[PDB]
Coordinates of C-alpha atoms (C1' of nucleotides) and ligand atoms in Angstrom, one line a residue:
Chain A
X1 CA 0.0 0.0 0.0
X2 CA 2.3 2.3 0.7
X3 CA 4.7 1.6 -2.7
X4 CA 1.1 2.1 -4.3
X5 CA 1.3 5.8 -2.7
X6 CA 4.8 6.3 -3.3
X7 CA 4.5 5.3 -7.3
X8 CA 1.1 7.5 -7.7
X9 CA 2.4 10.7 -5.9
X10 CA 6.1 10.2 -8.3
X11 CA 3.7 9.9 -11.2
X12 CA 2.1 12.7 -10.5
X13 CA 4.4 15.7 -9.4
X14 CA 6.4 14.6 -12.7
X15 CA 3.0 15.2 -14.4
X16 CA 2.6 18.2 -12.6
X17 CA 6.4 19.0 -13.8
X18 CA 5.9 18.7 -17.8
X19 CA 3.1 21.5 -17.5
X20 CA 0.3 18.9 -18.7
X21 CA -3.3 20.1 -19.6
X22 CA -5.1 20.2 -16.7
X23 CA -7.6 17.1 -17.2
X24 CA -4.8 14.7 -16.9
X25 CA -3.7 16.1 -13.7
X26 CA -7.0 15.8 -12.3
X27 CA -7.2 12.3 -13.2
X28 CA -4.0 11.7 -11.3
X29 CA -5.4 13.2 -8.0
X30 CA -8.3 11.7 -8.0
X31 CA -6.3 8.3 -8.4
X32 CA -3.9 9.5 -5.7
X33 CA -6.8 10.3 -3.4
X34 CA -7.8 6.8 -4.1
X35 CA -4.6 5.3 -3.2
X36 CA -4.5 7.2 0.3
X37 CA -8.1 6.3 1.3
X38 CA -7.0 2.7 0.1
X39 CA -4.0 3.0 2.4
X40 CA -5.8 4.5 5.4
X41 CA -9.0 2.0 5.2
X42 CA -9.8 -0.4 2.8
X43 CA -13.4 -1.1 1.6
X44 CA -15.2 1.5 2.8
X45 CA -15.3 3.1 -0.4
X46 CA -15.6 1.1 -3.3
X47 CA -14.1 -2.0 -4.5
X48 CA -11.4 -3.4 -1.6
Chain B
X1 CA -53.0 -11.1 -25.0
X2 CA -52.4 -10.9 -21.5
X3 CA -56.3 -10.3 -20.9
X4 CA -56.6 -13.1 -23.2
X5 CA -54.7 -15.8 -21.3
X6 CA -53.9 -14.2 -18.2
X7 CA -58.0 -13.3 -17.9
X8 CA -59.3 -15.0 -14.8
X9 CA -57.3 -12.6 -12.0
X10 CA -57.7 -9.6 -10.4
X11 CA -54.3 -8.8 -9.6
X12 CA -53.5 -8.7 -13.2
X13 CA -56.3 -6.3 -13.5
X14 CA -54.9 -4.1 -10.8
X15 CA -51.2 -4.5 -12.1
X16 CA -52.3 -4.0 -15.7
X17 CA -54.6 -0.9 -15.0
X18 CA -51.1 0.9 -13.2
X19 CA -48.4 0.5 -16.0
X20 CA -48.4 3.0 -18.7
X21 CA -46.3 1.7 -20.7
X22 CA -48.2 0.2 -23.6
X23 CA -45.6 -0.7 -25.9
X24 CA -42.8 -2.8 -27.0
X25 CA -39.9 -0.6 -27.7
X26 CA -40.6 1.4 -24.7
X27 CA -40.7 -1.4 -22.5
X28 CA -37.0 -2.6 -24.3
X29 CA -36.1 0.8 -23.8
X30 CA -37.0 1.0 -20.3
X31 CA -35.4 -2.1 -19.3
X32 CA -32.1 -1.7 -21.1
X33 CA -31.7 1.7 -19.1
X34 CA -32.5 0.1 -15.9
X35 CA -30.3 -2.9 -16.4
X36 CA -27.6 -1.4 -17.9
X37 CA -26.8 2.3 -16.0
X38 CA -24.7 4.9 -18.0
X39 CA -25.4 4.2 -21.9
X40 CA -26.9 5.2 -24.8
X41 CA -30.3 2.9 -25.2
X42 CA -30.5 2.5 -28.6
X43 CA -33.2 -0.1 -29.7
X44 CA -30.8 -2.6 -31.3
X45 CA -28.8 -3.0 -28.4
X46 CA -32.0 -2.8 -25.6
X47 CA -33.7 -5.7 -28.6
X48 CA -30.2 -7.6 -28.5
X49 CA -29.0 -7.6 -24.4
Chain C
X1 CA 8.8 30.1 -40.1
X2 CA 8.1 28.5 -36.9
X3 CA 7.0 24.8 -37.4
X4 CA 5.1 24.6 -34.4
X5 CA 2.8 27.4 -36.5
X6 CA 3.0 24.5 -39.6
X7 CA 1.7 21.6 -37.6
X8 CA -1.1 24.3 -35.7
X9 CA -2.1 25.2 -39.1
X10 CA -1.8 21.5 -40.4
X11 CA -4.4 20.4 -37.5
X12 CA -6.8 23.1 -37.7
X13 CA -7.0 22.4 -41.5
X14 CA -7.9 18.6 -40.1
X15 CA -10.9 17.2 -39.8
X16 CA -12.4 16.1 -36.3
X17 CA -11.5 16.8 -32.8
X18 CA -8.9 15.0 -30.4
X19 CA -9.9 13.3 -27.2
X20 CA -7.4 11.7 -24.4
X21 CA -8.6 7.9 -23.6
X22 CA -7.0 6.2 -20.4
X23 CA -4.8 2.9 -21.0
X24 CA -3.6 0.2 -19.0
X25 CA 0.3 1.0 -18.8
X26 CA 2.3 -0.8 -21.1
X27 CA -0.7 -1.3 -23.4
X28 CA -1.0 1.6 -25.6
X29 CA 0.4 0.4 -28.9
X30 CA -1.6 -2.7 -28.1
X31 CA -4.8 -0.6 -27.5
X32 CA -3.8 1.3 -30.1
X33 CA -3.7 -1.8 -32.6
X34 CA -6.9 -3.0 -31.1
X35 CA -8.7 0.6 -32.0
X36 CA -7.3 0.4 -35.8
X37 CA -8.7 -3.1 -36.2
X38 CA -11.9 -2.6 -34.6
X39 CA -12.4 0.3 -36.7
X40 CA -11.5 -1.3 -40.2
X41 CA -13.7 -4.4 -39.1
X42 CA -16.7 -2.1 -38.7
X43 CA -16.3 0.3 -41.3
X44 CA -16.6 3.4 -39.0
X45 CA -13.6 5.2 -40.6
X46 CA -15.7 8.1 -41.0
X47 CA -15.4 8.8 -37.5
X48 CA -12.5 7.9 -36.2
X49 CA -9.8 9.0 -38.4
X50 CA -6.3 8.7 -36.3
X51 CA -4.3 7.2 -33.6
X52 CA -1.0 8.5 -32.3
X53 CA 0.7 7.3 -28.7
X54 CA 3.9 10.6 -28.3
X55 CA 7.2 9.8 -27.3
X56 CA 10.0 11.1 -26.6
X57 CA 13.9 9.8 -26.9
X58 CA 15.2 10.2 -23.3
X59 CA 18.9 9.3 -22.5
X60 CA 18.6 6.6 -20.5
X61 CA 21.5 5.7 -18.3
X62 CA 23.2 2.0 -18.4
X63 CA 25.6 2.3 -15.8
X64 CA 26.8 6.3 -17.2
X65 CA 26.1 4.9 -20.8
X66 CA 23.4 6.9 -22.4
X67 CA 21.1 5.8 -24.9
X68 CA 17.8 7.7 -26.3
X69 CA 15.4 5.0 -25.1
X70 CA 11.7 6.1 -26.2
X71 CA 9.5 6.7 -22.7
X72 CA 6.3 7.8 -23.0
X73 CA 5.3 11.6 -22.6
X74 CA 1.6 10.7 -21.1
X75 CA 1.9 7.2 -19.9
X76 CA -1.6 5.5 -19.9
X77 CA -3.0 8.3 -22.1
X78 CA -3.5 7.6 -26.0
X79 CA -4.9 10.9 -28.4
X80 CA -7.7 9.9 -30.8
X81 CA -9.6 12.1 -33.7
X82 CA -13.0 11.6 -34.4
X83 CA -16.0 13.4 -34.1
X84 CA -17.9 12.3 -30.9
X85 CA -21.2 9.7 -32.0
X86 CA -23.1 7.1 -30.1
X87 CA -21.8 4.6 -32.7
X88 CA -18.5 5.8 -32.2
X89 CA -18.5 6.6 -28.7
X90 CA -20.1 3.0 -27.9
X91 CA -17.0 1.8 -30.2
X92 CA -14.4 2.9 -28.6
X93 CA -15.9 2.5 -24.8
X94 CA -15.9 -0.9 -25.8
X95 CA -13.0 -1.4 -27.4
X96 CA -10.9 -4.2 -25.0
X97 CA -8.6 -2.3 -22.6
X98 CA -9.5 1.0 -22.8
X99 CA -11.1 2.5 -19.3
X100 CA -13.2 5.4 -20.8
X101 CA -13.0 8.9 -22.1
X102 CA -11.2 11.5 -19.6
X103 CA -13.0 14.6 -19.7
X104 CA -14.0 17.0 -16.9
X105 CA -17.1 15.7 -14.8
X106 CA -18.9 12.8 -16.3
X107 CA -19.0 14.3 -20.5
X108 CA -16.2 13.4 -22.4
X109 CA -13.8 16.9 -23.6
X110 CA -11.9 17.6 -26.4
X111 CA -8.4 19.3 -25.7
X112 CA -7.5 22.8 -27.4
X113 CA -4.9 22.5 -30.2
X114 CA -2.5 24.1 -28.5
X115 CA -1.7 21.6 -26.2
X116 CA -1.7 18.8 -28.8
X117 CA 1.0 20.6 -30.7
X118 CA 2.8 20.9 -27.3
X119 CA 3.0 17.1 -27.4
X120 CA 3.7 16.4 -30.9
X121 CA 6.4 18.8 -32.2
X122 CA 9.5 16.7 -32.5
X123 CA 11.6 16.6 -29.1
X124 CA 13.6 13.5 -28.3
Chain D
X1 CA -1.1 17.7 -3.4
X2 CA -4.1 18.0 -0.4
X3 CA -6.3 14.8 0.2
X4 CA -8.7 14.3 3.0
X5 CA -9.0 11.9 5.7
X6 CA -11.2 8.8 5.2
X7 CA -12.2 8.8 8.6
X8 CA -13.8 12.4 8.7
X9 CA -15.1 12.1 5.8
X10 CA -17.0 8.7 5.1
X11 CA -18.2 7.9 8.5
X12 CA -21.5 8.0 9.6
X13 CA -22.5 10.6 10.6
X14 CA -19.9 13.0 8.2
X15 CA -17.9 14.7 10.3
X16 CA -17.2 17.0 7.7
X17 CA -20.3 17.5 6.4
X18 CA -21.8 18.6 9.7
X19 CA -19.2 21.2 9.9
X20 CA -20.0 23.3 6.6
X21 CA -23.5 21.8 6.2
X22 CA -22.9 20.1 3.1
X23 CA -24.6 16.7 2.5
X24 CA -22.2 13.5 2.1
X25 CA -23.4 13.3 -1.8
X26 CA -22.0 17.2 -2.6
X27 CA -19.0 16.1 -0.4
X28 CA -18.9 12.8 -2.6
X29 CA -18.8 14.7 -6.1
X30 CA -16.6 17.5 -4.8
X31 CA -14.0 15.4 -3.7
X32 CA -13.3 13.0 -6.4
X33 CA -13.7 15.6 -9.1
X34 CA -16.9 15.6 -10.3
X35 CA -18.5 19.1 -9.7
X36 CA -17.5 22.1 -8.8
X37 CA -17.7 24.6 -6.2
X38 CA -17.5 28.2 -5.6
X39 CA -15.2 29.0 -2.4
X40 CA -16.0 32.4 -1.8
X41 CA -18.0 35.4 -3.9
X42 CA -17.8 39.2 -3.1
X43 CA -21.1 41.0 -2.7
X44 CA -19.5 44.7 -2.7
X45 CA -18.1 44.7 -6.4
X46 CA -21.4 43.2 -7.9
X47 CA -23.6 45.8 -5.7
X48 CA -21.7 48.4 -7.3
X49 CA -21.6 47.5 -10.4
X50 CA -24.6 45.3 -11.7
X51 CA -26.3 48.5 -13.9
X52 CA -23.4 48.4 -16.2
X53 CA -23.7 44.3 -16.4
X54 CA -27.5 44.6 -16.9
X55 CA -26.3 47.2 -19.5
X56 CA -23.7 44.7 -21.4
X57 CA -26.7 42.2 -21.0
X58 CA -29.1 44.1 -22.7
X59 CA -27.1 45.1 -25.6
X60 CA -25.2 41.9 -26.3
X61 CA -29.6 40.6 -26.1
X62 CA -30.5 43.9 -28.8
X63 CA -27.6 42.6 -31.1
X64 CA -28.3 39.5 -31.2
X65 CA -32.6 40.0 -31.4
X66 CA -31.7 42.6 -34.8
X67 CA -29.7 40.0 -36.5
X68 CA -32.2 37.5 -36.0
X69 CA -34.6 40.1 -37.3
X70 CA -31.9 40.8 -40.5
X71 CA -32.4 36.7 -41.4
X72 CA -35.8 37.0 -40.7
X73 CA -36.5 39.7 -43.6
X74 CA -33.8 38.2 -46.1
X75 CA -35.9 34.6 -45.3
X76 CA -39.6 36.7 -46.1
X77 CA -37.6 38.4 -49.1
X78 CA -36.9 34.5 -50.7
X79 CA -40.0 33.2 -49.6
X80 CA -42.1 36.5 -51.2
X81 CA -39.0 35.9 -54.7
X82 CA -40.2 32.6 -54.8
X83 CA -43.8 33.5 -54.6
X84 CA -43.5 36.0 -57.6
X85 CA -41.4 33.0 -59.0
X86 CA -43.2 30.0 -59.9
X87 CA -46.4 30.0 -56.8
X88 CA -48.2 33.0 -58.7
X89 CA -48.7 30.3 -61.5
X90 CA -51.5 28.2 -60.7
X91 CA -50.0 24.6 -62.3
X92 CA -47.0 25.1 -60.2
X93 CA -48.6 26.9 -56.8
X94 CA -49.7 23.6 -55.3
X95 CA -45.8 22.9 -55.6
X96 CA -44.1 26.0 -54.6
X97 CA -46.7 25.9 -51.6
X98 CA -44.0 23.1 -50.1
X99 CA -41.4 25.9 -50.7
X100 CA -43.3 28.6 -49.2
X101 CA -44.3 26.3 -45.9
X102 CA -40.4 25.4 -45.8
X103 CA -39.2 29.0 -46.0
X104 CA -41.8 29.2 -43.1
X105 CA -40.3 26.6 -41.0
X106 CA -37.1 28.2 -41.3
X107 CA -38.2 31.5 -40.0
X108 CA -39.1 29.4 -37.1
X109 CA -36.1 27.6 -36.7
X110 CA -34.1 31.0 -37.1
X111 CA -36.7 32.0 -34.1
X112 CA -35.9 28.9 -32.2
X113 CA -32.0 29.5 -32.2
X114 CA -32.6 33.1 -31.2
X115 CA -34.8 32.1 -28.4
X116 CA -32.1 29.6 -27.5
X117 CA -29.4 32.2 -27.6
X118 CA -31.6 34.7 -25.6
X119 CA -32.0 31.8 -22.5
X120 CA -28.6 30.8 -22.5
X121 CA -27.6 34.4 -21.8
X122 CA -30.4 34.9 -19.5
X123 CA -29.4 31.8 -17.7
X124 CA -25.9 33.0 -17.6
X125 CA -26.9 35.9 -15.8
X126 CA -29.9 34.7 -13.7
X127 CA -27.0 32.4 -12.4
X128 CA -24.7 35.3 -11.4
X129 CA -27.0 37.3 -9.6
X130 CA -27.9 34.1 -7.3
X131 CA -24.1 33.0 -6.3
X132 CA -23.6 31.7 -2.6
X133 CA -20.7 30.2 -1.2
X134 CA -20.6 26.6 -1.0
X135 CA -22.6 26.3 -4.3
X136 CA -22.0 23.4 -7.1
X137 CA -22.1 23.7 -10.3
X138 CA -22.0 20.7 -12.3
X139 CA -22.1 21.4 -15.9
X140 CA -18.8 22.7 -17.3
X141 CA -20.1 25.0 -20.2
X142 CA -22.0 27.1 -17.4
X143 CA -18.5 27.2 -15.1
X144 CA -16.4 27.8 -17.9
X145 CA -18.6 31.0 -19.7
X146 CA -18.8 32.7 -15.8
X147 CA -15.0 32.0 -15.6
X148 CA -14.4 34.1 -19.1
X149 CA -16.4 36.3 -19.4
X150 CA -17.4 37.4 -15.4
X151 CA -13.9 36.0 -13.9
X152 CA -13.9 39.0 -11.2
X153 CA -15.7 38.9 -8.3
X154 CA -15.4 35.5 -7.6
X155 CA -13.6 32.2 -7.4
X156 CA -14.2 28.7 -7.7
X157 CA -12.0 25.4 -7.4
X158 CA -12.7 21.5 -7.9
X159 CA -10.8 18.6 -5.2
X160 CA -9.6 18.8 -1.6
X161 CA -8.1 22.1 -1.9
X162 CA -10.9 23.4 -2.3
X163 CA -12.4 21.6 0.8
X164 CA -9.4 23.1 2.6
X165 CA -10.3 27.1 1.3
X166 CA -13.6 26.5 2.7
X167 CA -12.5 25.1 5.8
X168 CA -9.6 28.1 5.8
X169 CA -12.7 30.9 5.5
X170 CA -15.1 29.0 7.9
X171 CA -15.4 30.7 11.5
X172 CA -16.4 28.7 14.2
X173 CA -18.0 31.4 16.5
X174 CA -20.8 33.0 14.2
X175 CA -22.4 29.5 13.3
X176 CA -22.0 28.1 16.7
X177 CA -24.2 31.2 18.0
X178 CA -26.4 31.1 15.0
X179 CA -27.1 27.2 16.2
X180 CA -27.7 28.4 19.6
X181 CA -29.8 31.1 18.7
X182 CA -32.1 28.6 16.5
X183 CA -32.0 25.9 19.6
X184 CA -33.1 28.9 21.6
X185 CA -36.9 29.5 19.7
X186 CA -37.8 27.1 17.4
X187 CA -39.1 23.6 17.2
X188 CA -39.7 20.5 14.7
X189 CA -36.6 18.4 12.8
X190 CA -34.6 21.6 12.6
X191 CA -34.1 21.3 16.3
X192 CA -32.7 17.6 15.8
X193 CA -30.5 19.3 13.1
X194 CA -29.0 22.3 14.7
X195 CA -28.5 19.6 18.2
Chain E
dC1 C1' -43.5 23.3 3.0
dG2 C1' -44.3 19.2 5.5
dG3 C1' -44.3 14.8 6.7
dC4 C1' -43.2 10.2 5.8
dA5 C1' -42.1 5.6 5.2
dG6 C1' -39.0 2.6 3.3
dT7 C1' -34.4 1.5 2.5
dC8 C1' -29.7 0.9 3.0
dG9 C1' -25.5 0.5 5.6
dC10 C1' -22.8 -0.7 9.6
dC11 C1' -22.2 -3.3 14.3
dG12 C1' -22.0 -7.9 16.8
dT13 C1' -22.2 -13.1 17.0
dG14 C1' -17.6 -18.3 23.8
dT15 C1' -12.7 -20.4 25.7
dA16 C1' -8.0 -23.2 25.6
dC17 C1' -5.2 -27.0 22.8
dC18 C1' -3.2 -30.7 18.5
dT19 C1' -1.8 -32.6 13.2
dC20 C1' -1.3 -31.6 7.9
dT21 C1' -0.6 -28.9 2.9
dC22 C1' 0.4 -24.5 -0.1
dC23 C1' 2.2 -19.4 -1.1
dA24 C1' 1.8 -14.7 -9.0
dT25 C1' 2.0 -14.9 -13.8
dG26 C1' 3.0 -13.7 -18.6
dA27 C1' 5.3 -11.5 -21.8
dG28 C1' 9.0 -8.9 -23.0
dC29 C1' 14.1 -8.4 -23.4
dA30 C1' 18.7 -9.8 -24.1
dG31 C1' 22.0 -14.0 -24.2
dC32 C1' 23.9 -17.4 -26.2
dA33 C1' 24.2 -22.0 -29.5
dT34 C1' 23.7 -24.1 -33.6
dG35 C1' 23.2 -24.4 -38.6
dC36 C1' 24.0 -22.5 -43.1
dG37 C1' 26.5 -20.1 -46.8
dC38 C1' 30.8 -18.3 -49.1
Chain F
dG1 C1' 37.0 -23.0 -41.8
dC2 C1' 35.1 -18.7 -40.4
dG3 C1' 31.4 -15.4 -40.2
dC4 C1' 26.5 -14.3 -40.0
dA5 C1' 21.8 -15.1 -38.6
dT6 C1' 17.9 -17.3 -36.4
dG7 C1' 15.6 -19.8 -32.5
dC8 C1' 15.6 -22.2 -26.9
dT9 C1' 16.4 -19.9 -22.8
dG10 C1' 17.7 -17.3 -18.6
dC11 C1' 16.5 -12.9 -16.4
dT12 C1' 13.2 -9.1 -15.2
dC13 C1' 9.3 -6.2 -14.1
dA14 C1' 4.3 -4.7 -13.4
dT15 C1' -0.4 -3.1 -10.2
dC16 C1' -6.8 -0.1 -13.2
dA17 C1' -9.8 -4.8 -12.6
dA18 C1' -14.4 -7.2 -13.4
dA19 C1' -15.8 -11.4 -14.8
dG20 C1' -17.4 -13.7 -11.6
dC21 C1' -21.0 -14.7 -8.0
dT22 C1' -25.7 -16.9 -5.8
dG23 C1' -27.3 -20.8 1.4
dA24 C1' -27.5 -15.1 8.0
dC25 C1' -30.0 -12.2 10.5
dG26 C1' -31.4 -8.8 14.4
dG27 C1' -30.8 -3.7 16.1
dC28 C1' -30.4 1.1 15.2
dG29 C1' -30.0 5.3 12.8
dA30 C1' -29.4 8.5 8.8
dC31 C1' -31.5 10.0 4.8
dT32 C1' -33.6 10.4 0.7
dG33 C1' -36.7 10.6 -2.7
dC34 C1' -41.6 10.8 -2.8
dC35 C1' -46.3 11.6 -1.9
dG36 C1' -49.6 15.0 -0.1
Chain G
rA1 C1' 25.0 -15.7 16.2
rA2 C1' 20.5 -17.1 14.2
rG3 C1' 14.8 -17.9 12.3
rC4 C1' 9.7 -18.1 13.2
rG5 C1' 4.3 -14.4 8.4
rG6 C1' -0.7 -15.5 5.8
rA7 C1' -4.7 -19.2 3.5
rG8 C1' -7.3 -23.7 3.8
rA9 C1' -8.6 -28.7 6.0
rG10 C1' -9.4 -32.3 9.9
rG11 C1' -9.6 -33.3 15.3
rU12 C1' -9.8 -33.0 21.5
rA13 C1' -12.5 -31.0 26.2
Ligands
2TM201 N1 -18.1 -27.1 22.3 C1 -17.6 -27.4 23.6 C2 -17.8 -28.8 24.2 C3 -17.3 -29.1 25.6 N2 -16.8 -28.0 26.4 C4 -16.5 -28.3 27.7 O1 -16.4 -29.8 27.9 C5 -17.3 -30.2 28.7 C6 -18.3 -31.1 28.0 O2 -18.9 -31.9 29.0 P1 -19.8 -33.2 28.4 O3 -21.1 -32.8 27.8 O4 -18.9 -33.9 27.3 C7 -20.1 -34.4 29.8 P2 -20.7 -33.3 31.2 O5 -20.8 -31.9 30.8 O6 -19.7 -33.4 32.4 O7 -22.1 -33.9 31.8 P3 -22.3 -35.5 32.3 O8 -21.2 -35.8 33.3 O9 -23.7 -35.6 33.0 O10 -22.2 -36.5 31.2 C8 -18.1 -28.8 29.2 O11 -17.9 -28.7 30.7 C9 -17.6 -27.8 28.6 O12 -16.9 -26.9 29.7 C10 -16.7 -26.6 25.9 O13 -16.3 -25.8 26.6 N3 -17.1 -26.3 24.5

DNA sequence: CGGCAGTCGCCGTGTACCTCTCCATGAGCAGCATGCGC
DNA sequence: GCGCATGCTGCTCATCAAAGCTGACGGCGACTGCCG
RNA sequence: AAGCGGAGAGGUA
């Protein structure tokens, strides 16, 4: 769980880095967000 | 039809007297968007699922 | 003359509008190949016209020996032009491995040509 | 970048959402980017200014209602040419009468866009005038058309940061005594809700 | 506005001990090893 | 006899996957559309 | 100077 974070916050700031439009970064929060909430507690959102 | 076979109930009656739906595509229709959420019910795919 | 200007002018002369469809990550040529042979198999060329995954030649390092390896700009991320139908739009939803359309809220959006040319303009 | 807490957010009851009375569905969409909401508005600017928008309003709606007028005569022109063309003749009037009746359909449709036009620009503005914090806003053509054209005067955002400016301009003392005050006279389910 | 009734989701469901088996894949990317041609 | 090319084989790395599954039941509260 | 986690199945009071 925690590599899961690790690789989706590196895959994002270097998103964020190469000034990407805007949609695609917002995809990669939300997934982020995911992976936290995932992390934290695991199925109370979702599929586990 | 369905007073023609089914024609010896009165809970038919009552369940056909509160449908509004008399029809075939619409029913297809209806069913394809309650079955399947979040897509474009076309009548060949709500005839074909 | 500024070739970014050629290829602006190029795409605007082009027919269609270009949409960003999510991927599984090391499938994009794959989906990519599955998109061109759906589309032939149907005969819906006359909505979805191209398919184009950028790259870029980055030096990767073996040890201090550099070699421009291709990595993807957009990993996950494949850039199709067609003109949004339910035909089409069931098509490509459909197709096997592709997620969905990205767009803002639930609607599918089409990117501005700007940033396409930002990611197509030769680079590696 | 900012993400929320699971626990405060998706337990029941929302701890969150009994903070900025929001229910757990807004919460829901806001989060995982799927609507958007407007953090924070000023009254001041659009009090002083709102003649000179109703102004810009009304103009932009006189443009738009004497081109529609312009295609409306060049459409009665052609249909009143083709009249005096072939429908003055009685072998070919019973013809020509589909021409004239489709020259009248498309006065209407040129009607029909206009009226659209004219609602999408009075939506637009009936829209404005009503803006409250803590608002959402779900379709993006709406949001984006505010954003361009009335971008002063207020600000919106989408995610957790945006949860986090709403939580930054929250204050805890005026809503606590506004609770009290309702707890104080007042009776029903809004009793069970400000408890 | 005002109630309102169903519906959905989450919480809990006894104690201590003994013996046995099994635990991610597929496809890609070099790295040779052998046969064929000049 | 040597060089070149093609096919077993060792090593290596990824998380967004979904068609499968279907025989628990009482207590308590939020809440949500839905009728009136 | 050196290791000891999970899943399933069957038993005793
Ligand atoms: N699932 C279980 C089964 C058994 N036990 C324990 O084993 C004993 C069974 O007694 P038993 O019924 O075998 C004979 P007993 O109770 O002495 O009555 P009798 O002399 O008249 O024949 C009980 O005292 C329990 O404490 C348990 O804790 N959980």
């Amino acid at each position: 769980l925690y590599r899961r974070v690790i690789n989706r916050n590196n895959r994002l700031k270097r998103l964020i880095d190469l000034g990407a439009p805007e949609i695609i970064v917002n995809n990669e929060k939300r997934m982020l967000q995911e992976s936290v909430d995932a992390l934290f507690d695991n199925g109370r959102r979702g599929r586990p | 039809q369905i007073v023609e076979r089914f024609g010896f109930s009165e809970i038919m009656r009552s369940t056909l007297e509160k449908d509004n739906t008399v029809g075939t595509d619409e029913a297809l229709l209806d069913i394809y968007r309650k079955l399947r959420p979040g897509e474009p019910p076309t009548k060949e795919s709500a005839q074909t699922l | 003359v500024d070739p970014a200007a050629a290829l602006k002018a190029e795409l605007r002369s082009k027919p269609g509008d270009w949409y960003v469809v999510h991927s599984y990550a090391g499938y994009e040529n794959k989906v990519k190949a599955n998109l061109e042979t759906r589309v032939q198999n149907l005969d819906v060329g006359d909505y979805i016209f191209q398919v184009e995954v950028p790259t870029e030649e980055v030096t990767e390092i073996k040890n201090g020996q550099r070699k421009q390896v291709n990595r993807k700009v957009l990993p996950g991320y494949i850039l199709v032009r067609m003109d949004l139908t339910d035909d089409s739009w069931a098509a490509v939803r459909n197709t096997p491995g592709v997620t969905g359309f990205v767009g803002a809220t639930s609607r599918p959006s089409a990117l501005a040509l700007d940033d396409v040319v930002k990611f197509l303009l030769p680079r590696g | 970048a900012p993400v929320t807490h699971i626990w405060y957010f998706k337990g029941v009851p929302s701890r969150l959402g009994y903070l900025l009375d929001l229910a757990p569905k807004d919460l829901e969409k806001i989060i995982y980017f799927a609507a958007y909401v407007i953090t924070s508005v000023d009254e001041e600017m659009r009090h002083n200014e709102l003649s000179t928008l109703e102004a810009e309003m009304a103009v932009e709606r006189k443009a738009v209602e004497d081109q529609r007028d312009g295609e409306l005569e060049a459409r009665a022109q052609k249909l009143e040419a083709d009249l005096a063309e072939l429908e003055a003749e009685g072998a070919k009037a019973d013809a020509r009468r589909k021409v004239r009746d489709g020259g009248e359909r498309e006065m209407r449709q040129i009607r029909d866009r206009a009226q659209r036009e004219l609602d999408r620009l009075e939506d637009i503005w009936s829209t404005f005038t009503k803006l409250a914090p803590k608002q959402l806003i779900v379709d993006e053509n709406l949001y984006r058309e505010l954003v361009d054209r009335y971008g002063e005067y207020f600000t919106g955002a989408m995610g957790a940061e945006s949860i986090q400016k709403l939580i930054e301009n929250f204050d805890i003392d005026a809503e606590a005594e506004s609770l009290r005050d309702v707890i104080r006279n007042g009776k029903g389910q809004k009793k069970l809700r400000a408890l």
